[PDB]
Structure formats: C-alpha cells, structure tokens
C-alpha cells in the first residue's frame, strides 16, 4: 500500500495524520507508531501519529479488507 503520511511540522507533542493507499475497499488498518502507542487500530485506510518525544520514530501498518491486506512501513523525525 502507499504510505501517505500528511502532516505539518512534527515537533515534540504533535499529531501527524497518516493514510494508506492500495486496498481501495479498506474498512480497518493496523498501524504501529512506537511513540508510546505501539499497535494502532485505525479505521479504513487512515490513522494519525501522536508523537510526544523529541527524536526519531518508525511507522508500519497492516491493511485489513477481510480477504486482502497490505504492509506499510514509514519513517518519522520529530524535533523540539
């Protein structure tokens, strides 16, 4: 799936907003922030990252269509 992670500046304590693109009919996805919130039960092909510490972060996602899925893996760099 495509890693669409739209957001403005990512300073310590920012809410980035992500979204995956591939399994058109997405009703649920599972991201992985790792910023305190590891597993991420998001709806459809969309979610958002809540970064609160100044440093770097790693992102991943699992698409769930019921009979199909997708693997996501983005990167993040939050400052302060």
For residue 63, give the CATH number of its domain: 2.60.40.10
Q: How far apart, in whole angstroms, are the C-alpha atoms of residue 13 and residue 28?
A: 25
∠ CA 75-33-70, nearest 5°, is 75
Three-class SS state of 64: strand
37 CB neighbour count, 10 Å cutoff: 13
Residues whose CB falls within 8 Å of the CB of residue 64, separated by 6 or more in sequence, listed in order: 26, 27, 28, 29, 30
Measuring CA to CA, which residue among 39, 72, 33 is closest to residue 53? Answer: 33
Q: How distant is the alpha carbon of residue 20 from its chain centre?
A: 8
DSSP class of residue 35 equals S
Structural domains in the chain (count)? 1
Which residue segment(s) compose the domain that 76 sits in? 1-80
Q: How many Cβ atoms sit within 10 Å of the Cβ of residue 60?
A: 17
Give CA–CA dist 26/45, Å, rounded: 5
The C-alpha atoms of residue 69 and residue 29 are separated, in whole angstroms, by: 9
> Are residues 47 and 19 in contact, defined by beta-carbon separation less than 8 angstroms?
yes
């Amino acid at each position: 799936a495509t890693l669409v992670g739209p957001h403005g500046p990512l300073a310590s304590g920012q809410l980035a907003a992500f979204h995956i693109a591939a399994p058109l009919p997405v009703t649920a996805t599972r991201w992985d922030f790792g910023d305190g919130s590891a597993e991420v039960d998001a709806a459809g092909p969309a979610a958002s990252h809540r970064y609160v510490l100044p440093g770097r972060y790693h992102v991943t996602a699992v698409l769930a269509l019921g009979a199909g899925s997708a693997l996501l893996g983005t990167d993040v760099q939050v400052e302060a």
